[PDB]
Design a protein around this ligand. Structure first.
Ligand SMILES: Nc1ncnc2c1ncn2[C@@H]1O[C@H](COP(=O)(O)OP(=O)(O)OP(O)(O)=S)[C@@H](O)[C@H]1O
Ligand SMILES: Nc1ncnc2c1ncn2[C@@H]1O[C@H](COP(=O)(O)OP(=O)(O)OP(O)(O)=S)[C@@H](O)[C@H]1O
Ligand SMILES: Nc1ncnc2c1ncn2[C@@H]1O[C@H](COP(=O)(O)OP(=O)(O)O)[C@@H](O)[C@H]1O
Ligand SMILES: Nc1ncnc2c1ncn2[C@@H]1O[C@H](COP(=O)(O)OP(=O)(O)O)[C@@H](O)[C@H]1O
Ligand SMILES: [Mg+2]
Ligand SMILES: [Mg+2]
Lengths: 49, 328, 49, 348, 49, 319, 339, 261
């Protein structure tokens, strides 16, 4: 039978996979970058950032 | 410079080997025709199979040609069957001219003496069978195994197979007397009997222990103590103390006895052997006998796997302890 | 900006096994009954072994 | 330069106990064609001092010079390994076990080159060079087979003393061609005698009560007895009969571990004991030593029917431990099964 | 959990590993060696694994 | 006119057509689209699509210059010290005019047959010419590659393929080939290909050339495995602890001539997905692994399978 | 290099007046003459005559007839004036490394033929002995030369061959030859050679051979020369295989007597007959499923002899293992006999 | 019963060094027509053929047809210790397993004799018909040696092409491409040979460097060499030794594949 020795299910998932990223990273401004710098400094207080 | 006694005192010729009659007859007939078959010697070790094949090769060939025309190899190689097959091919391919001044020319086929013939897998043995059929005419072999049963069937169908039953204790007692009188060492006959009974019918191990004992003592009297601890044989009152501790009802004296055995240097394997030898010939119940003996078997496996002697002996003594104290 | 946690399981190739919605420890914590989920857990252990 | 090596006997006649087999070794070296020797006994019983004494008796005192040489060998699997070996102009020293599954490799080539050294170096002293293989019980089966092939190829070229603690892992063909030398542990009185001897050799005088207590606490391990005696010397310049003989620190850490074992049976206790065994294994203690110590500790509180059960489960789990690779899993399996049994036992 | 440690002890001893442990040294946490440098020769292994 | 094998007749030419390991597929897609790819070590099971992904990535990144800016080494080539001395360095120094962001590409097909010193030589060459040259490698076991070769690269992992993906590709190829079939043949043809659909297309071609119709019986006549229903019956008898029939048909498989190893492997993959209790499944798996170690160590006899079966059967009766 | 000298010398080699290798007497010539595995041979004929021969992997236990089969196929495809120009025969006799695969194989598969135009063929006997890297180059030389030259891989152990190499070829298993088809062959040999043999002789000849006619001819040849008569006793004595009466008495001793008596009897019989405990374990396991026992007896007994067969592998004392073998029966079956 | 008298041993030394690496063994078959050798490669890609007429030898004697096989390595070891100016005797018995090489005295004071065992092997008479070749050229041997060793260090394979313009050599190596063009008007001054064609159609094939270098190991046999080449029937290298015989060589081309789109 179908799926007797494996996972052959009659139903198949469509649309869950093939999620293309197409990610466009906006260049960070001064303020958000400095906030991230202070987050790094608070994570590692012994580092000369 | 000197040689060990085992090859120094092995018989030169067939007919000089004792206790075997049909074997001597068929080997002598094959020597008369100068066409020795492919041999398959099976029997307990030390029975003289290597001595018989060396004597046969010494009779057929010349003593200077004997070592030239024999190649002694073993077959449990850790590098596989391809290495020893390549050595066999090298030895058979390499041919040296040989003649005898006694008036009889040598047969063209050489001799490769391959021991431990019961120790290989079926695939390696089939590879050796292909090597056999490669050199059927130009070399005839002699395979020596402890048990003929492990031989796969194509080899056993083309080899003359010979049983070598162990020798009755009187004849190798006489032989060890011959060794002692020819090697000028002072031994009591009780010492020779004890050496026989710890040799367990192995003449080769007996004469090895004899030469080793006479070189330990340096000409002194070979006592029962030196032959007790040259074979690793445990003193029997130690076994009796182990059984008394198991009968006693205390685990503290049990572990004390085991500590006494281990700090004495006595190995666990020999202790298992003699414990088994006592248990098999006792008045103990077959239920207890069975439980103790299967415990002994798995303890033998455990110690062969690298486990501690002490732990396996404690667990073994605990099982024998519980089996004895259940009825009590 | 949004954080981008998850390079660790991507390094071990675990994103080739699980759904992008699925998390590693989240899949570990719940009860495994589905045959497909259990084959993915088998493939996970097969990758680490 | 501690007490065990500075005051080590150098010749056979300088041995203090077990004189008889020392004289038999003197007879063996007098015969001049000794075959391969296997020597065995518990640790600290004096095996290595007997070995080097028969070495010094065998050749001249050029045995007494020692250096260290390093050997780089390609594997048959083509992965070279580097090992450190002790060497002399007359003997070699190899402990092969550091190669693990490559022990077999460490079997041939050095000995082969020692054979080549016997073919190279000529001094007209004796017709072989001896090499001490240490801890031959840890040799694998194929390593022992390769050793058998080496010995049945080079019996006329080199010789070998086989220092071990048990001949169980020695396969019977190896036991067949090498002469057995059982070296039992010294008795209490022998330890006290050699201990007073080494104290007078140190210029120190102690009461015999301290010697007997130290001999009993050393459990017939003479090396441990001499080391501990030296520790007692460092503790106190004079020797008083009630001086506190110090305890081995990993032994007492194991004892406090066993106290945590018998005290409380909780999963947090299992995990913290697991961390303690992690600390022990990072301290490079062998797992069977840790096991023997912890079981000998915990058996004192065990009742009569519990002691035997602990015995077979300990032996079974350590059988798997030597079968296994990482000893952590087997040790934790034993400790958790003992948790189960012990918790099942006080509840009824 | 004790049954689980019995199982994982069984997986250490009485299951084989994909890569044979202590192939060139002994088990871990050993001061003897462990400096197993990779091979330096072009000749193939010619092994029978 | 020539019978092109379907494994190369239906090898994908565009990266999106490859299924399996879809996250790394999308990453390879965006690297084909933009470029400036780093050095790649693809590792995974054989027949997964590693060589296909590498070659399609190279084709998409190069285009017309694929005959010149690309060069390939497999185990069929020399791949000794002297060639990684001369040839690959000569190419890595060789000038090739390319579009911007596009680099010369070297593929080492199945680098597990590189000798150790060959990799030791390859490290400096691959790391110094990184401005104009990128390296791609494939392997099955990552440990056969020495550590600095990993340490100078990005390593990516491939997995055994999901059965739904294999089913889609097989219905695709039988649609493009007009193959008469049943579902029985589909589960047979996939069971013979555990996540490696190179086996699936191979045994599909074998079934179609040998019988012309796809059903379970044809697949097991050409692949010649022990039958899945027989071993399902074995473990079902184990659930009933019925020793007689299970041993009878095990002896039937034995005198049928199947090796110990594929029988124990099939026993594994059948009691894996069998519908029964999880604790007894755990016991069954550890027992069959224990017996498999017996075959693996050398001792492989009917007595071993009999003791296997007996301990399996006594697991049911003993709580 | 060479070793084809010895085979070519060996093919017309016999004394022909005194030597009688009847294993060499009866050789099939073609696929219509190899009377076994008819589906496989007809499939080969179909693939040959359509010019649709795929890459082949002939595997099975040795002696089932792979080499003679593919030799017949090679002589069928190509005539004797062009056989060396299109078929390359190699094996593991010429093992120098992986240089064989990138030497003669890679050079041979890279070229067209010499005299006449057609597809070529390479047979690689005992290809199980090829190393992993040699096979791993062999897969590539198959992939990039598949349209010119077909490949035949003769093997004996299917599992060791790497998955891609089995992937690029179809496979044919030469299974054991069924006894109902092998009795007429041995009856023909017996009637042609005037041999006296009883029904136990036929049963032992087919049981020991395990579906191999070569090994059967070897056994009957040896027994006929050694004794002049062939029966169960004569075959097993010439083979040095466990006699069924002997192991039956061994089973009787464990199932009737006590521990010590059966112990010493079996020990004396092993000394007397030269038996190693592996074969006793095999033959008693052959007796276990035949003799009527309850299910609990069967599982307990089978597990115990399985563990004994394990423990015998590492090389422990065979004496204590014999003792535990007796103990396995002593625990259950003799207790029920007392019951 | 077979006697052959090689007039000069230089030719035998030259043919042996010409075939020293090519073949596993030499199997000669002798007839009253002469001696022949059609032995085909261990890697199974090429064939050496040598036919020497009976009248070329000082004395050629046969009783019947005989095919004997000799291992090449020991044959080379024997012949490398022979003077080139010497007159050689090859003696073969009717049914014995040993061939005798009776070298006369190179120093005029020591006649040498060596023996060789016979190695049995399956040898078939590869009786190929000599079809009409679509491309036939004659061109000097030393030039063909210098150009093969030129292209060998460039390329692992050479593309031969024969056209109406002339004969043309390409080799696309990793260092780069190497091309050599000859012409029919191109006549050399080293050995005074005018390169000619008798061709019919242009043909392009590819051959490995190694075998062709060891075919040029047969350079000193003849001043010029005849190349015969067809679209299907493979490369033929033919040396015509003066009054001795002819030395044909069959080399199959590598397959060519079209690059995928
Ligand atoms: N994921 C896939 N999608 C589509 N076709 C595939 C896939 N995997 C394999 N194939 C097909 O099977 C063939 C084998 O692919 P390969 O990439 O060579 O396998 P691999 O994953 O590289 O592992 P190898 O080759 O054994 S090292 C390809 O040429 C395709 O025809
Ligand atoms: N079905 C068969 N019928 C008759 N003779 C057979 C049959 N199978 C094998 N033989 C004999 O086996 C000889 C050679 O068979 P092989 O092909 O060598 O066997 P194999 O299966 O290839 O395994 P090998 O060669 O022993 S490793 C033939 O000459 C026959 O005498
Ligand atoms: N029947 C016998 N007659 C004479 N000497 C014997 C006999 N049996 C054993 N020996 C002696 O015992 C030794 C046995 O050595 P070996 O031939 O290796 O025995 P096996 O081959 O059985 O192991 C021989 O050296 C021989 O001196
Ligand atoms: N007769 C003796 N006199 C002095 N010290 C001894 C004597 N015998 C043994 N010892 C000591 O006992 C210790 C045992 O160590 P070792 O020689 O390695 O034997 P083992 O291998 O049994 O530990 C040695 O350090 C040695 O100093
Ligand atoms: Mg690939
Ligand atoms: Mg075959």
């Amino acid at each position: 039978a179908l799926g007797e020795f494996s996972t052959l299910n009659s139903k198949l998932k469509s649309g869950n996979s093939a999620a293309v990223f197409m990610r466009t990273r906006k260049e960070f401004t001064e303020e958000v970058r400095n906030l991230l710098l202070e987050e790094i400094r608070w994570s590692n207080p012994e580092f000369s950032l | 410079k000197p040689v060990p006694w085992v090859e120094k005192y092995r018989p030169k010729c067939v007919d000089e080997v004792a206790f075997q009659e049909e074997v001597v007859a068929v080997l002598k007939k094959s020597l008369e025709g100068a066409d020795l078959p492919n041999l398959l010697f099976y029997g307990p070790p030390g029975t003289g199979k290597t001595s018989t094949i060396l004597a046969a090769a010494r009779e057929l060939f010349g003593p200077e040609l004997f070592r030239l025309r024999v190649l002694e190899l073993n077959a449990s190689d850790e590098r596989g069957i391809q290495v020893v097959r390549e050595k066999v091919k090298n030895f058979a391919q390499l041919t040296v001219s040989g003649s005898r001044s006694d008036g009889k020319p040598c047969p063209p086929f050489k001799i490769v003496i391959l021991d431990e013939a019961d120790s290989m897998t079926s695939a390696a043995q089939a590879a050796l069978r292909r090597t056999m059929e490669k050199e059927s005419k130009t070399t005839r072999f002699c395979l020596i195994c402890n048990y003929v049963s492990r031989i796969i069937e194509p080899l056993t169908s083309r080899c003359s197979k010979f049983r070598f039953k162990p020798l009755s204790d009187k004849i190798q007692q006489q032989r060890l007397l011959d060794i002692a009188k020819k090697e000028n060492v002072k031994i009591s006959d009780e010492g020779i009997a004890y050496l026989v009974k710890v040799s367990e019918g192995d003449l080769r191990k007996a004469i090895t222990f004899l030469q080793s004992a006479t070189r330990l003592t340096g000409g002194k009297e070979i006592t029962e103590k030196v032959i007790t601890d040259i074979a690793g044989v445990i003193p029997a009152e130690k076994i009796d103390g182990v059984f008394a501790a198991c009968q006693s009802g205390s685990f503290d004296k049990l572990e004390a006895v085991v500590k006494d055995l281990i700090d004495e240097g006595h190995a666990a394997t020999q202790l298992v052997n003699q414990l088994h030898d006592v248990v098999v010939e006792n008045n103990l119940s077959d239920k207890q006998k069975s439980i103790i003996t299967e415990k002994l078997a798995e303890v033998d496996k455990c110690l062969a796997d690298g486990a501690d002697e002490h732990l396996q002996l404690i667990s073994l003594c605990a099982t024998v302890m519980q089996q004895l104290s259940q009825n009590c | 900006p949004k954080c981008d946690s998850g390079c660790a399981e991507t390094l071990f190739g675990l994103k080739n096994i699980f759904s992008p919605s699925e998390d590693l420890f989240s899949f570990l914590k719940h009860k495994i009954t589905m045959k497909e989920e259990w084959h993915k857990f088998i493939q996970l252990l097969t990758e680490f072994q | 330069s501690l007490w065990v090596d500075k005051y080590r006997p150098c010749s056979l006649g300088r041995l203090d106990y077990h004189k008889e087999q020392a004289a038999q070794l003197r007879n063996l070296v007098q015969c001049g064609d000794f075959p391969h020797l296997l020597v065995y006994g518990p640790s600290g019983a004096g095996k290595k001092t007997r070995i080097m004494c028969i070495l010094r008796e065998l050749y001249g005192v050029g045995v007494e010079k020692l250096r260290i040489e390093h050997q780089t060998i390609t594997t048959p699997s083509k992965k070279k390994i580097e090992i450190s070996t002790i060497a002399s102009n007359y003997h070699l020293e190899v402990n092969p076990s550091d190669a693990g599954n490559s022990d077999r490799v460490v079997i041939q080539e050095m000995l082969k080159t020692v054979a080549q050294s016997q073919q190279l170096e000529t001094n007209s002293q004796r017709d072989f060079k001896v090499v001490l293989l240490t801890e031959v019980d840890k040799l694998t089966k194929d390593a022992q087979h390769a050793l058998r092939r080496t010995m049945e190829k080079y019996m006329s070229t080199c010789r070998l003393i086989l220092c071990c603690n048990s001949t169980s892992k020695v396969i019977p063909p190896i036991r067949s061609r090498c002469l057995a030398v059982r070296v039992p542990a010294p008795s209490i009185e022998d330890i006290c005698h050699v201990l007073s001897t080494v104290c007078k050799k140190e210029g120190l005088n102690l009461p015999s009560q301290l010697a007997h207590r130290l001999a009993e606490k050393s459990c017939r391990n003479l090396r441990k007895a001499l080391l501990m005696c030296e520790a007692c010397r460092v503790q106190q310049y004079p020797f008083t009969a009630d001086q506190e003989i110090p305890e081995t620190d990993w032994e007492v850490y194991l004892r406090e571990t066993a106290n945590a074992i018998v005290s409380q049976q909780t999963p947090q206790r299992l995990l913290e004991v697991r961390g303690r065994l992690y600390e022990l294994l990072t301290h490079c203690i062998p797992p069977e030593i840790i096991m023997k110590g912890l079981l000998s500790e915990l058996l004192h509180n065990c009742d009569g029917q519990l002691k035997g059960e602990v015995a077979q489960m300990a032996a079974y789990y350590e059988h798997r431990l030597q079968l296994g690779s990482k000893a952590i899993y087997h040790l934790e399996a034993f400790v958790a099964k003992f948790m189960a049994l012990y918790k099942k036992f006080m509840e009824d | 959990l004790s049954e689980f440690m019995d199982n994982m002890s069984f997986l250490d001893a009485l299951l084989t590993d994909v890569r044979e442990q202590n192939k060139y040294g002994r088990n871990d946490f050993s001061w003897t060696n462990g400096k197993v440098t990779s091979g330096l020769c072009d000749e193939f292994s010619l092994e029978s694994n | 006119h020539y019978e092109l094998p379907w494994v190369e007749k239906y090898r994908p030419v565009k990266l999106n057509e490859i299924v399996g390991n879809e996250d790394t597929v999308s990453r390879l897609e965006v690297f084909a689209r933009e470029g400036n790819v780093p050095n790649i070590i693809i590792a995974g099971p054989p027949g997964t699509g590693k060589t296909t992904s590498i070659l399609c990535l190279a084709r998409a990144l190069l285009g017309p210059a694929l005959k010149d800016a690309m060069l390939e080494l497999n185990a069929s080539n020399d791949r000794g010290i002297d060639v990684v001395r001369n040839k690959i360095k000569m190419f890595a120094q060789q000038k090739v005019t390319l579009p911007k962001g596009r680099h010369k590409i070297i593929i080492l097909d199945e680098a597990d047959s590189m000798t150790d010193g060959a990799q030791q030589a390859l490290r400096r060459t691959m790391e110094i010419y990184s401005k104009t040259t990128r390296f791609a490698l494939a392997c099955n076991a990552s440990d056969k590659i020495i550590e600095p070769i990993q340490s100078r690269c990005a390593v990516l992992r491939y997995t055994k393929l999901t059965d739904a993906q294999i089913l889609t590709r097989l219905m695709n190829v039988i649609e493009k080939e007009r193959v008469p079939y049943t579902d029985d043949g589909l589960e047979a043809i996939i069971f013979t290909a555990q996540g490696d659909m190179r086996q699936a297309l191979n045994n599909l071609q074998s079934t179609f050339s040998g019988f012309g119709f796809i059903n379970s019986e044809n697949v097991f006549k050409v692949c010649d495995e022990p039958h899945p229903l027989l071993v399902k019956e074995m473990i079902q008898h184990c659930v009933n602890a019925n020793i007689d029939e299970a041993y009878k048909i095990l002896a039937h498989l034995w005198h049928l001539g199947y090796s110990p190893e594929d029988i124990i492997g099939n026993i594994f993959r059948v009691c894996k997905t069998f519908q029964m209790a999880e604790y007894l499944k755990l016991e069954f798996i550890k027992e069959i692994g224990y017996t498999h170690m017996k075959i693996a160590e050398g001792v492989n006899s009917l007595l071993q399978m009999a003791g296997l079966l007996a301990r399996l059967c006594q697991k049911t009766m003993a709580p | 290099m060479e070793t084809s000298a010895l085979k070519q010398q060996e093919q017309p080699a016999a004394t022909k007046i005194r030597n009688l290798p009847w294993v060499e007497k009866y050789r099939p010539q073609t696929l219509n003459d190899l009377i076994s595995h008819q589906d496989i041979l007809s499939t080969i004929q179909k693939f040959i005559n359509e010019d649709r021969l795929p890459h082949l992997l002939l595997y099975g236990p040795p002696g089932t007839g792979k080499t003679s089969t593919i030799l017949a196929c090679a002589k069928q495809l190509y005539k004797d004036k062009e056989f060396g120009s299109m078929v390359l025969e190699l094996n593991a006799s010429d093992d120098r490394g992986i240089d064989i695969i990138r030497g003669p194989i890679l050079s041979f598969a890279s070229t067209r033929t010499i005299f006449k135009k057609g597809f070529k063929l390479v047979i690689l006997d005992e290809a199980d002995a090829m190393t992993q890297d040699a096979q791993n180059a062999l897969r590539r030389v198959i992939e990039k030369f598949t349209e010119n030259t077909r490949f035949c891989l003769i093997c004996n152990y299917l599992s060791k061959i790497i998955p891609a190499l089995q992937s690029r070829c179809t496979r044919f298993r030469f299974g054991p030859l069924t006894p109902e088809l092998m009795v007429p062959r041995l009856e023909h040999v017996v009637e042609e050679e005037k041999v006296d043999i009883s029904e136990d002789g036929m049963k032992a000849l087919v049981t020991l051979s395990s579906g191999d006619m070569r090994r059967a001819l070897n056994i009957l040849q040896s027994t006929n020369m050694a004794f002049g008569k062939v029966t169960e006793e004569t075959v097993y004595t010439c083979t040095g295989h466990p006699l069924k009466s002997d192991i039956a008495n061994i089973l009787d001793w464990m199932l009737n007597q006590d521990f010590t008596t059966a112990y010493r009897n079996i020990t004396e019989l092993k000394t007397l007959k030269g038996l190693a405990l592996h074969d006793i374990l095999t033959e008693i396991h052959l007796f276990v499923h035949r003799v009527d026992f309850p299910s609990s007896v069967r599982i307990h007994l089978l597990t115990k002899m399985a563990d004994i067969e394990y423990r015998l592998s590492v090389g422990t004392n065979e004496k204590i293992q014999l003792s535990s073998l007796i103990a396995a029966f002593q625990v259950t079956r003799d207790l029920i006999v007392a019951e | 019963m077979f006697e052959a008298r090689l007039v000069q041993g230089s030719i035998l030394k030259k043919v042996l060094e010409a075939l020293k690496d090519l073949i596993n063994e030499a199997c000669w078959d002798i007839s009253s027509s002469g001696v022949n050798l059609q032995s085909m490669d261990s890697s199974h890609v090429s064939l050496v053929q040598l036919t020497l007429r009976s009248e070329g030898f000082d004395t050629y004697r046969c009783d019947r047809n005989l095919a004997m096989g000799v291992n090449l390595t020991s044959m080379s070891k024997i012949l490398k210790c022979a003077g080139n100016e010497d007159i050689i005797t090859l003696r073969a018995e009717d049914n014995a397993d040993t061939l005798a090489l009776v070298f006369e005295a190179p120093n005029q004071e020591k006649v040498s004799d060596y023996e060789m065992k016979l190695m049995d092997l399956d040898v078939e008479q590869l009786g190929i018909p000599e079809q009409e070749y679509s491309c036939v050229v004659k061109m000097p041997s030393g030039e063909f040696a210098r150009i093969c060793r030129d292209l060998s260090h460039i390329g692992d394979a050479v593309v031969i092409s024969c056209a109406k313009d002339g004969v043309k050599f390409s080799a696309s190596g990793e260092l780069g491409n190497g091309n050599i063009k000859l012409s029919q008007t191109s006549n050399v001054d080293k050995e005074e040979e005018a390169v000619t064609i008798e061709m019919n159609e242009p043909v392009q094939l590819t051959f490995a460097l190694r075998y062709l270098n060891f075919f040029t190991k047969a350079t000193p046999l003849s001043s010029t060499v005849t190349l015969s080449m067809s679209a299907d029937v493979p490369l033929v290298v033919e040396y015509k030794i003066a009054d001795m015989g002819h030395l044909k060589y069959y080399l199959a081309p590598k397959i060519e594949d079209e690059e995928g789109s």
